[PDB]
Design a protein around this ligand. Sequence first.
Ligand SMILES: CC/C=C\C/C=C\C/C=C\C/C=C\C/C=C\CCCC(=O)O
Lengths: 10, 260
Amino acid sequence: RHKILHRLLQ
Amino acid sequence: ADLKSLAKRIYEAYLKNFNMNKVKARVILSGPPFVIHDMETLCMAEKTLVAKLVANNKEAEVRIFHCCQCTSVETVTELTEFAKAIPGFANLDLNDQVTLLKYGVYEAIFAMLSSVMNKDGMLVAYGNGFITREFLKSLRKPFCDIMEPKFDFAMKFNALELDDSDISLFVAAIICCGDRPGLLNVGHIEKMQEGIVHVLRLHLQSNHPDDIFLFPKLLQKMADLRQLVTEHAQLVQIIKKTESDAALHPLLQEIYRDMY
Ligand SMILES: CC/C=C\C/C=C\C/C=C\C/C=C\C/C=C\CCCC(=O)O
């Protein structure tokens, strides 16, 4: 549900 | 544990990850930034600083709001890197990392925005523009309502005379907040928060011996920021629903969605 934030966190 | 070292590590991460800090901003604000005080100078600044946006065009207020969102997107990215450098953050469940950032980024954004604001305006576009507070007030509704509460917060926040070493810890405390909705490991986050807040408390004692209430003042500012963000999100929803041309960037849509 937070694909971008989740990506930035990787 | 070495609290002085944790504070220095958080400060170093702040200096590394944010393009703007209070020292940089003050150098610029002291006197180069192109001054935006009316529609003529807005249009001139756009042609120099965001040429692609006016090479076609939307209403001036909608173009300004687009530049607002672009700034927020960039600051969210900086905050995510900063958070990943906060000692202990990376050990959290990835879902909790997302939750902490979702609820914390706009509180942190408006706290840090104070560093580029004075009573007359604010730095924009990576320090290359200065847009006046009166010009933003002059925009048509609802866009003239975006920035004024943020200036009001910043004037009182700036009167605290914090420096970047303080603000870095304050932003870390904003992010490391155990009462955000939907957290999975509340206990661990609360202990992480307790640790960061302890470092903040000791740092303020050392750095501001003149102001014995600075720590409780800053706790109150954290609560003020949560209210500011709740109200900001409400205005953004009004804009999203009534302003077809004011497209919301997808990262900001995912942050706002199901927030308050
Ligand atoms: C040359 C023109 C470029 C920039 C000047 C135009 C607009 C101001 C730019 C940035 C303002 C700074 C921060 C935005 C603060 C609040 C609105 C945030 C919008 C949001 O993400 O919900």
